[PDB]
Design a protein around this nucleic acid. Structure first.
Ligand SMILES: Nc1nc2c(ncn2[C@@H]2O[C@H](COP(=O)(O)OP(=O)(O)OP(=O)(O)O)[C@@H](O)[C@H]2O)c(=O)[nH]1
Ligand SMILES: [Mg+2]
Ligand SMILES: [Mg+2]
Lengths: 388, 51, 273, 102, 135, 233, 62
RNA sequence: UGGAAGUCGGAAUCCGCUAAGGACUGUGUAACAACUCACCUGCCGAAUGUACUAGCCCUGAAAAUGGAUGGCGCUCAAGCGU
RNA sequence: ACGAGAUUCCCACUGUCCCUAUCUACUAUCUAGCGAAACCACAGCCAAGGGAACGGGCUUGGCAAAAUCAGCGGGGAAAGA
RNA sequence: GGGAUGGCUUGUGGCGGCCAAGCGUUCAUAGCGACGUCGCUUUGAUCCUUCGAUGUCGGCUCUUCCUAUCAUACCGAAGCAGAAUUCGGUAAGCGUUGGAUUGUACCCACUAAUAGGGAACGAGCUGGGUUUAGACCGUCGUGAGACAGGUUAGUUUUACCCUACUGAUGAACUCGUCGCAAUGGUAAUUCAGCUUAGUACGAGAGGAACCGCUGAUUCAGAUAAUUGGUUUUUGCGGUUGUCCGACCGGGCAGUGCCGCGAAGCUACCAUCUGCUGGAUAAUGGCUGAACGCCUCUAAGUCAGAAUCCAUGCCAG
């Protein structure tokens, strides 16, 4: 018969299958729609998640209960070393979809991006792109000019290839991350000129994004392995000492068809899924060369974004960093893709101006109450090892 | 507020009616935290004589 | 209003009642001598007068040992103006009125000698003494008897004579818009364990019982109200909670149990002629 | 069907003013505007139809307890519903009168 | 109006249905027993719960006897479950306590013993008027 | 507002400027809408719409007929005192369907074991248990006649007077299916019952009141919930 | 309540996009484009002018 | 009838001038007024109106996993009658 | 008075529950060695029809790609059934 | 030894009498009969009329479907002034709760609402119908025993097989990097507050709505800066008994016990986020024939629902 008391489904069918992601680096499924009257710009970037911290923000939100008051908010720090552009990929439109037509690479490629093409870089002869580097020299780059004009003549979507400088991060990985970033705005010839002018040049994060802008974060979430139905889907636990498991679903079926349905909660892989989260506000784009990039106009303490004793399981941030309000999918040390919003925003929160008053730099390795080592030294006073 | 957006859009300026010796200080960012200490705790009119 | 005060009005109970009425020739309506007009089911009397006048309704005033004999005789006169009435103390060992009731049933059986047997069904409120009356007439504890209401839940034939049968019935409560939960609890419809906030009915008990009887019963005197009475009774009897706080709820439940079980003497005076 | 009819009839009765509980000015003003006898007759017929519908429903539920086939159950249900419809059809004029008065 | 305060920020709800809290005013009641909260959603097996400033339906279990026969609207003014405000402060009171009011928010009592919550004082001006300490 | 305030508003301000035009256009499109409803409504709504349209067509045809002739009986001639009036002494229903004993009685199972005893029979049809009826003891009753199936009055129609009155039943004279059914007093179709006709004023030739008369049950009480009978005058 | 996929809400959001958030996102776009423009600026066969050929199937093989 | 003039009601429903006009078909007024219908005349230009009957078509009642003129599909049929 | 007898309630008490979370040991897991049994017409994807309201084989369709591992209890199988 | 009605059903009674379009019927002038109508089934009462378990239902968890729509969206009508509604239509996108009562199905509250069903009733777990063996009472029997019955306590215990489902690998095509998207899934939901505005409307009492802004309910996906929880970090300290002669330093009491406790995992017990185009249904129209008036429809065409299909989103 019918179900006596109605209840909504556990979990969403929009995120099936709950399998592991096919690739560690997040995939930009869709780019913002291209307007040829707009100026040329890049639409995405990558960074690495350092960790989280606490801020105090002077809120300017008219009509809110916390208007003209101080709010405490959680933010995420993403270390963003500059990206090097080493390629240009052309796309054409076919009745089967977008198709890549050709790819033009730069003359000189770093060992960081050359490691990406190899699984055993230490045993290799490192021969990658060696014959390709000679077509810049033979016939004055006639083949390079031919492919570039092929992109200018036949292609409609132009994407640069950009790789991260992972050597500036505290990660033990030396293999860099390479991705396609779509050039939006202008004509196709303008895009190709823009890309060739950007070969072999480092691009920083502040030339792609700006403070107070809402972006999207694409990554792979924290993996949990094989997890049962109670934590995987949120089903109600069976009573105590239920025979054959109580952290289970009592009925995986009581009705026709004589099958198990795809909508029934089953134990399996939980976490390590590919997720795209939208509407994340950028609160601060701090510069690596600044020695006071975690100091506000009211907090005059000259200090950096790195917490006291460093980030837990990441290290110390010494490059340009992005502070994002809230949380992002992924773990520490994980590659993150920051993307422009696909649509014009419809909220006043995306038009608000963020005025930070304090950033927490205390230790996340415990109940740290000091923001700098000098503060701890002044509070504790003189110790035995000082006279020793 | 009705000419500048309406209720919930117009942002009021709370420093417009401040009475200061110099009107150029009307929109300064008053420091609060310095080296892990409160500035308002050290604010004193006789701070020069005490120093 | 709690469903515990809705107890006694169930359609299953009234189906049992109408089954007993349909199977019975003589209907013994049992009244409590402490509350005769309160325990009278004029609902069933109207039904019998309208639909089945051939059945014979006989009043039995039970629990006459809890009332003074003059008041019992006055109530006997008042009820015998209406219907044939027998006074009875329903006990197996020491009954009263058993011979008179058996004589009346013998008169009815000789009157219905054409039938093979007659059936006498007992009706009334809960805890008026129906099963006790059946046991007293039988001489053997053939029906279950308890001081709690609703001990009898189904109808039971008991063979008194070869030509006279006795039918037990669950206690019925006719619905009335003037009856209060306090009135039903004082008539003994409900159990005091299930009711919530028992100490509100203590003033009604203190009104219905003379003060000297309560003082002699509990060896306790000098209270100004029911709250202080329950508190000093709790302190005397040791009914204390954690932290030396008196158990006024439990003491009120004890007082109500004594009131409906007849440990505390009380009665309703008969109307003056 | 009985519960729907009883709910509607109780909504009609419990919302119209009770003349005995009004101020004498309001009671006599309604006696001038409306025939007070006709007002009380219309509302009494509404209450009578409500009670008779309840009695019909109880009787036919009791008969459906002892019906032994789907055809007999169907005939009993149709009989009860037809009796309720006849009882409502015998109220053509009081309903119009009460709507105008409302 | 069904007694649902507007403009209430989300905080931890520490008082489910069945809880007994103190009665902070001088209306004559000593404690309140919660039977429902106002503005509760529909969810299977979930007990309705309320926090500081929430209006609940309560019954008097200890107090003056004529308060024990009715169901009163109440506003929770203190809770012992720690909750966070928008300024990042996690806080909790010494006990769970509330005050009996009408459906419109006006208090039946005349004074409040002990402090009241900021949220309760914000959403009920009569409690802010009859309060002595606001925390 | 007070009294006829919408009418006063129309008197002082009128109606909407397109109200008459919209009403006229709606009345013009009523024919198209009626045909679309007739050809596009589905199910019970369509059946009710069709029945109501048939009713209005019949009424309109009769109205047209009455406006057309606005400007315009037995065989043998008999006097006025013989009008409206009408051997073999047969009942109105001389033959009915016989009722089998499974249709009449159902088996009531009793006992506590899995194997029950089935000697009790419950009468499934309406019965008249008689006057001063008290049920037998449960150990000794075989035929169970439930209280909800007992009738004491019947809607009896006088054939010549053409009036129906509710009369008490005195006895069941003949149930044509089985003498046992007559002994049990079962009220089915074609059953002869005895009714008290004291409320009809039937009188003997000298002044004695005829207070008992036979009647025949002409309906199916087990399917109708009522007993309908015709006097045997 | 009005849904997210409601015509009136879509029209209100379209008006908001056209009138309010549009100029702000635009001005941010010229600022960012100028900033990264600063970084960007700071025979036919033998010259590649004529795009020649690079150095299952759609048809039946025949 | 407080008011009721064809048009809130009850009962009758005639005559004249007629080409024709009901003691009136609706709108409307507190009641009137006013408009309109039935009916007549002028313009026009040749076939229409009412009710039935016989074919095909729509509806004429339907639940609950996704599905069945056997499937694709078929519209001067690859449907229906000869 | 006594009772591992049956029932209702009160205080205390608590993860019984809101509403689940975390930890430990032994398994389950992998490896070396050792190593059965139940059961078994043949085999195992469905939808509609298959008069004997049965279908896994028939008809008509959907369709359909080696070989595998951990769980699972819808169906088949499985209860000295 | 043998077994374990169904293209049914739904919203409008019966009996008896009139009336009647019609069907029949002209050498008999009978008989059926739609639509209706008439008789039987308290001046707003009474509460002093509850009328028979042989047939059995519930509950937990969880998923999906139907519409015969309770709420949300839109629309038509009503003395519908406003507010609150009532009746009806399209619509299943999205929700439809927490409790009391077993002397044996109705009450209470919250809420936008607490709509109805199917896939069982034509070997998941657990309480009654329900009933092996022990026992007691009632009725019947001379009796063994049976039952109108009532009460108590009481033995079925898989999965490692195939398929289905949930996940995880994988040969062949040299290896690897960056991509495309056929197909499959698909997601948001409702309420409140500020402003409009004490304005429209109203005699008064009262009292909206569009645009704009801010939160919250339920669902969903993440996350651990902070706050709780968890402690084999057996990290540090305290402490009971015993043992190593005492101290120091340790063992054992399966983690002796206790306090704090990073890190990790976690919680509407914590925080963050949840997005836009087209085509339509009901209806409202424009132009205009059928049909010399007329008409939203016939040709053509405009708008319009949370609907439908896609984008965003997940898999590849
Ligand atoms: N003093 C006194 N007490 C009596 C008398 N008769 C009965 N009682 C008490 O009243 C209580 C009720 O006895 P029951 O036989 O159960 O009466 P009941 O009306 O059938 O009660 P229910 O089982 O609930 O229907 C018994 O516990 C007796 O103690 C009497 O004659 N005198
Ligand atoms: Mg008793
Ligand atoms: Mg008894």
């Amino acid at each position: 018969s019918h179900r006596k008391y109605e209840a909504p489904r556990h979990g969403s069918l929009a995120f099936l299958p709950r399998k592991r992601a096919a690739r560690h680096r997040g995939r930009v499924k869709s780019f913002p729609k291209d307007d040829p009257k707009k100026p040329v710009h890049l639409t995405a970037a990558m960074g690495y998640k350092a960790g989280m911290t606490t801020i105090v923000r002077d809120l300017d939100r008219p009509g809110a209960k916390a208007h003209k008051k101080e709010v405490v908010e959680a933010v995420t720090i993403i270390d963003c070393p500059p990206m090097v552009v080493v390629g240009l990929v052309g796309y054409i439109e076919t009745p089967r979809g977008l198709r890549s037509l050709t790819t033009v690479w730069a003359e000189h490629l770093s060992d960081e991006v050359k490691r990406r093409f190899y699984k055993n870089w230490y045993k290799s002869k490192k021969k990658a792109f060696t014959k390709y580097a000679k077509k810049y020299a033979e016939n004055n780059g006639a083949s390079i000019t031919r492919e570039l004009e092929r992109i200018k003549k036949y292609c409609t979507v132009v994407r640069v290839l950009a790789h991260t400088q992972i050597r500036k991060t505290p990660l033990k990985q030396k293999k860099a991350h390479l991705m396609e970033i779509q050039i939006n705005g202008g004509s196709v010839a303008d895009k190709v000129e823009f890309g060739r002018s950007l070969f072999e040049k480092p691009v920083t994060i502040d030339t792609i994004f700006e403070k107070d802008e809402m972006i999207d974060v694409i990554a792979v979430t924290k993996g949990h392995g094989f997890v049962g139905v109670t934590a995987r889907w949120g089903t109600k636990k069976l009573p105590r000492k239920t025979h054959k498991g109580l952290r289970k679903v009592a009925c995986i079926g009581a009705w026709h068809p004589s099958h198990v349905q795809w909508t029934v909660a089953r134990a399996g892989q939980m976490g390590y899924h590919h997720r795209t989260s939208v509407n994340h506000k950028i609160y601060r784009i701090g510069k690596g060369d600044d020695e006071a990039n975690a100091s506000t106009e009211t907090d005059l303490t000259k200090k950096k974004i790195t917490p006291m004793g460093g980030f837990v399981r990441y290290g110390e941030v010494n490059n340009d960093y992005v502070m994002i309000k809230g949380s992002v999918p992924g773990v520490k040390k994980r590659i993150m893709t920051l993307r422009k919003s696909l649509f014009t925003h419809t909220s006043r929160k995306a038009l608000e101006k963020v005025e930070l008053k304090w950033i927490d730099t205390s230790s996340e390795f415990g109940h740290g109450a000091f923001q700098t080592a000098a503060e701890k030294k002044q509070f504790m006073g003189t110790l035995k090892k000082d006279l020793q | 507020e009705e000419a500048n957006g309406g209720a919930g859009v117009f942002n009021v300026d709370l420093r417009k009616d401040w009475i200061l010796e110099n009107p150029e200080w009307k929109y300064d960012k008053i420091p609060e935290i310095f080296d892990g200490k409160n500035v308002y705790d050290y604010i004193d009119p006789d701070i020069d004589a005490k120093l | 209003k709690e469903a515990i005060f809705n107890k006694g009005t169930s359609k299953r109970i009234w189906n049992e009642l109408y089954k007993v009425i349909d199977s019975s020739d003589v209907i013994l309506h049992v009244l409590d001598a402490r509350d005769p007009l309160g325990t009278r089911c004029r609902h069933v009397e109207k039904y019998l007068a309208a639909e089945a006048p051939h059945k014979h309704l006989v009043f039995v005033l039970n629990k006459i040992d809890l009332v003074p004999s003059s008041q019992a005789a006055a109530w006997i006169r008042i009820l015998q103006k209406d219907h044939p009435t027998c006074a009875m103390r329903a006990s197996i060992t020491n009954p009263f009125g058993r011979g008179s009731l058996i004589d009346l049933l013998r008169q009815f059986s000789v009157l219905h000698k054409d039938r093979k047997q007659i059936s006498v069904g007992l009706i009334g409120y809960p805890n008026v003494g129906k099963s006790s009356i059946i046991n007293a007439l039988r001489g053997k504890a053939v029906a279950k008897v308890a001081p709690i209401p609703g001990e009898t839940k189904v109808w039971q034939y008991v063979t008194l004579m070869k030509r006279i049968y006795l039918i037990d019935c669950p206690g019925i409560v006719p619905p009335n818009q003037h009856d209060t939960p306090e009135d039903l609890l004082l008539r003994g419809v409900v159990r005091v364990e299930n009711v919530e906030h028992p100490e509100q009915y203590i003033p009604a008990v203190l009104r219905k019982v003379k003060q000297h009887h309560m003082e002699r019963t509990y060896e306790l005197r000098g209270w100004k109200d029911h709250i202080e009475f329950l508190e000093m009774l709790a302190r005397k009897s040791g009914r204390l909670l954690k932290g030396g706080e008196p158990d006024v709820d439990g003491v009120a439940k004890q007082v109500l149990n004594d009131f409906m079980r007849g440990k505390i003497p009380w009665f309703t005076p008969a109307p003056e002629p | 069907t009985q519960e729907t009819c009883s709910e509607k009839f109780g909504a009609i009765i419990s919302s119209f003013p009770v003349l005995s509980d009004q101020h004498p000015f309001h009671r006599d003003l309604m006696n001038i505007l409306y025939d007070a006898d006709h007002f009380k007759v219309a509302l009494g017929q509404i209450s009578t139809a409500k009670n008779l519908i309840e009695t019909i429903s109880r009787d036919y539920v009791r008969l459906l307890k002892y019906a032994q086939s789907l055809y007999q159950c169907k005939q009993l249900k149709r009989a009860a519903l037809g009796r309720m419809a006849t009882l409502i059809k015998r109220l053509k004029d009081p309903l119009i009168y009460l709507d105008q008065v409302r | 109006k069904r007694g649902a305060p507007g403009g209430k920020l989300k905080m931890t709800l520490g008082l489910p249905v069945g809880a007994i809290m103190n009665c902070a005013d001088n209306s004559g009641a000593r404690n309140l027993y919660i039977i429902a909260v106002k503005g509760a959603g529909a969810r299977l097996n979930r007990l309705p719960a309320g926090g500081v400033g929430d209006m609940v339906m309560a019954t008097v279990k200890k107090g003056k006897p004529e308060l024990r026969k009715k169901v009163h609207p109440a506003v929770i003014v203190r809770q012992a479950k720690p909750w966070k405000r928008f300024d990042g402060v996690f806080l909790y009171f010494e006990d769970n306590a509330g005050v009996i009011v009408n459906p419109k928010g006006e208090m039946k009592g005349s004074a409040i013993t002990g402090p009241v919550g900021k949220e309760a004082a914000e959403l009920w001006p009569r409690i802010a008027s009859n309060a002595g300490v606001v925390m | 507002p007070q009294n006829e305030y919408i009418e006063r508003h129309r008197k002082l301000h009128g109606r909407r400027l397109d109200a008459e035009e919209r009403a006229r256009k709606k009345a013009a499109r009523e024919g198209h809408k009626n045909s679309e409803n007739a050809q596009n409504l589905r199910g019970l709504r369509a059946k009710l719409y069709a029945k109501q349209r048939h009713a209005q067509k019949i009424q309109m045809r009769k109205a047209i007929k009455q406006h057309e002739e606005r400007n315009v009986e037995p065989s043998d001639p008999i006097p006025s005192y013989l009008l409206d009036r009408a051997a073999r002494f047969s009942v109105p229903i001389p033959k009915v369907r016989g009722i089998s004993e499974e249709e009449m009685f159902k088996v009531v199972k009793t006992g506590k074991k899995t194997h029950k005893k089935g000697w009790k029979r419950i009468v499934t049809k309406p019965t008249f248990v008689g006057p001063d009826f008290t049920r037998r003891p449960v150990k000794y009753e075989r035929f169970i006649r439930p209280m909800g199936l007992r009738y004491k009055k019947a809607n009896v129609t006088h054939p010549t007077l053409n009036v129906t009155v509710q009369l008490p039943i005195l006895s069941v004279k003949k149930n044509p299916s089985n003498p046992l059914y007559t002994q049990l007093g079962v009220l089915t179709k074609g059953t002869i019952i005895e009714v008290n006709v004291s409320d009809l004023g039937i009188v003997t030739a000298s002044g004695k009141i005829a207070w008992g008369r036979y009647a025949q049950i002409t309906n199916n009480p087990e399917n109708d919930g009522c007993v309908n009978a015709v006097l045997l005058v | 309540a009005k849904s997210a996929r409601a015509s009136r809400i879509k029209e209100n959001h379209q008006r908001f996009k056209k009138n309010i958030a549009g100029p702000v996102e635009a001005a941010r776009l010229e600022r960012l484009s100028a900033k990264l423009m600063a970084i960007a600026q700071a025979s036919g066969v033998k010259s590649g002018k004529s795009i020649g050929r690079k150095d299952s199937s759609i048809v039946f093989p025949m």
